[PDB]
Design a protein around this ligand. Structure first.
Ligand SMILES: [Cl-]
Ligand SMILES: [Cl-]
Ligand SMILES: [Mg+2]
Ligand code: NA
Ligand code: NA
Ligand code: NA
Length: 325
DNA sequence: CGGCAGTACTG
DNA sequence: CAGTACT
DNA sequence: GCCG
């Protein structure tokens, strides 16, 4: 279980020559839609990174959880010949599929459809493809959404959101989560979690917050924002700080009731692989973990803090920086 | 043999 | 619903 | 792809 171990184990990858090759294959399977095969590769790559020494034999490889016969056969090939033959036999569509699936709002199904229809470049997409509203925004920001920002900029973005929220309710609590909270030097987007310790005033805040942030020109486009019925849980969109030298940045906001704060903080801090491992562990123990609660397979268990979730799952606590799986 | 996380929008 | 998205 |  990855969630039972510190992610600092990957700080020194004694198997980088193997993992750099498997990562190419994992991405090729992923963009072609074979998500489960790609997941198996992702987990094997993480196991190889965290392993304490270079892998040198077939029996050694199989002893690692996440590495089976077929993955072991690939390891010994790399060790004996320095090359992996399958990398020379990837489907020729893969580079274009990767290009297309990096449009926000397009996944494997859309990329494969565009490829089938004869498109091969973003010029083809721009001029000839049918784009959803979201995908047209993704394309307009194609380069910017592949950039990571310095964490100092993420601080500025969180503070912009926080100042706007607290301007109409000074008791609101705002926390930047994701890779920022895990201590990374750069961040792909800014994840802001908002709650209120009174357990009630979090309701009806999205409408005022978003209009405030629109009034000052901070939000430049919206991707996901269900503002019609008042039950909105998340906002996914695009922002840009004022002044020269600023790029458009992805911004994700969730508003949660205080009773769900610890589970929401755990979820939104990630990493994604950390969450999937913790949720899988919960299932083996007759429980279920979501952004809303830790439950039995059910009864909601009391989790006032992140530490309580770890404890109820029988896991030693990990600080956010040690969840970077 | 079948799961592989669990959830929130969009149209 | 399927697709894509969040961590 | 891996695992129970
Ligand atoms: Cl969730
Ligand atoms: Cl906490
Ligand atoms: Mg985000
Ligand atoms: Na290691
Ligand atoms: Na194994
Ligand atoms: Na995409």
């Amino acid at each position: 279980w990855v969630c039972a171990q510190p992610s600092s184990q990957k700080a020194t990858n004694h198997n980088l020559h193997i993992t750099e090759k498997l990562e190419v294959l994992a991405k090729a399977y992923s963009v072609q839609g074979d998500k489960w095969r790609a997941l198996g590769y992702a987990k094997a790559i993480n196991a190889l990174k965290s392993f304490h020494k270079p892998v040198t034999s077939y029996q050694e490889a199989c002893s690692i959880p996440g590495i089976g016969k077929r993955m072991a056969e690939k390891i010994i090939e790399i060790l004996e010949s320095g090359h992996l033959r399958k990398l020379d036999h990837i489907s020729e569509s893969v580079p274009v599929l990767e290009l297309f699936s990096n449009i926000w709002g397009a996944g494997t199904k859309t990329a494969q459809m565009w490829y089938q229809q004869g498109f091969r470049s973003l010029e083809d997409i721009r001029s000839q493809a049918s784009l959803t509203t979201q995908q047209a925004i993704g394309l307009k920001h194609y380069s910017d959404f592949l950039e990571r920002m310095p964490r100092e900029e993420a601080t500025e973005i969180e503070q912009t959101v926080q100042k706007a929220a607290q301007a109409f309710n000074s008791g609101l609590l705002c926390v930047a989560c994701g890779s920022y909270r895990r201590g990374k030097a750069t961040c792909g987007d800014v994840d802001v979690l908002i709650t209120h310790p009174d357990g009630r005033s979090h309701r009806g805040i999205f409408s005022r917050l978003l209009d405030s942030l629109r009034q000052e020109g901070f939000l430049t486009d919206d991707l996901v924002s269900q503002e019609e019925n008042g039950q909105q849980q998340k906002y996914l969109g695009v922002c840009r700080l004022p002044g020269p030298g600023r790029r458009h940045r992805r911004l994700d906001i969730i508003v949660v009731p205080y009773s769900e704060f610890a589970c929401a903080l755990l979820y939104f801090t990630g990493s994604a692989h950390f969450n999937r491992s913790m949720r899988a562990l919960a299932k083996t123990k007759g429980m279920s973990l979501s952004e809303h609660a830790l439950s039995t397979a059910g009864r909601v268990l009391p989790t006032p803090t992140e530490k309580d979730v770890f404890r109820l799952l029988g896991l030693p606590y990990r600080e956010p920086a040690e969840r970077d799986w």
